Ligand SMILES: CCOc1cccc(-c2nnc(N)s2)c1
């Protein structure tokens with residue numbers, strides 16, 4: 612169980628002005644820290660944010676949050692559930708900003724909602740330094756779905772923040788799960804992200820912003836475009852046939868047209884990962900994995916995800932029998948026998 616702490620700086624808020632926060636389980640004998648970003652889509656104007664507030668309110672407010680949460684998957688402390696980092700200090704950061712963790716805008720007389728995702732991450736890091744993070748050797752910023760995209764948008768800013776605060780020896784790294792999307796042709800959101808950035812006062816990494824420039828910052832929400840601009844090591848986990856990708860593409864006895872569409876999506880995803888040295892991409896139809904209790908079950912080329920992450924750790928000190936780049940080559944969902952049922 613991880614215990615809730617609401618942020619002492621009450622100007623850093625969820626969508627409705629209530630305080631943001633984090634859940635924490637400390638491990639006194641460890642210098643590794645795992646900060647996980649929750650996912651859950653986003654909203655991009657007054658009307659669809661109002662709808663979200665009616666029936667997805669825990670993603671917009673802390674008023675009804677429970678005081679504890681059970682750590683699962685990579686946030687579990689049991690070695691049998693989490694062979695990778697079971698003895699680490701564990702942090703779960705709830706997603707209550709509806710902005711893919713990019714926003715920097717307060718609620719005010721002209722803004723019905725606050726969008727403070729980028730500032731929530733910075734404030735969590737600041738307040739954790741007084742609770743033991745000042746002694747860390749590695750800070751892994753991880754996340755799933757919108758939280759995986761949030762890793763890509765924020766990992767280098769966390770590294771810069773710790774450098775400027777006088778902690779140049781903490782190694783900052785990223786783990787992006789199910790946040791690597793393609794701005795492809797639909798079978799039957801670039802615009803929704805463009806509108807969202809203006810609504811949220813969204814911020815993107817500096818080098819990516821300089822490449823694409825004003826009005827085109829939406830490009831930096833797409834992994835294959837923002838990843839080459841990053842300096843921190845990032846490990847990319849992505850199902851080749853991601854369900855959120857297919858939903859946006861308007862895909863739901865498969866005939867030739869849809870067969871070719873689905874095979875081309877897998878091929879394109881594989882192509883964007885060809886030069887990503889730390890990656891895990893199985894040929895499955897699914898969505899998210901790293902905080903699932905059965906995350907230990909899937910394998911690519913005989914290597915599990917916890918093993919690949921451990922091999923990544925060793926590489927940051929090629930390794931015999933300890934691979935870090937694992938991408939399936941077979942071209943149809945569930946051609947990998949270990950896919951989630
Ligand atoms: C942060 C990006 O989020 C997503 C997620 C899933 C799909 C898409 C898109 N698909 N087709 C497009 N033209 S954009 C974007």
Ligand SMILES: *[C@@H]1O[C@H](CO)[C@@H](O)[C@H](O)[C@H]1NC(C)=O
Pocket residue numbers: 620622623730
């Ligand atoms: C509180 O958070 C706001 C928003 O990021 C920031 O401008 C301010 O400096 C913070 N105050 C303190 C005391 O940390």
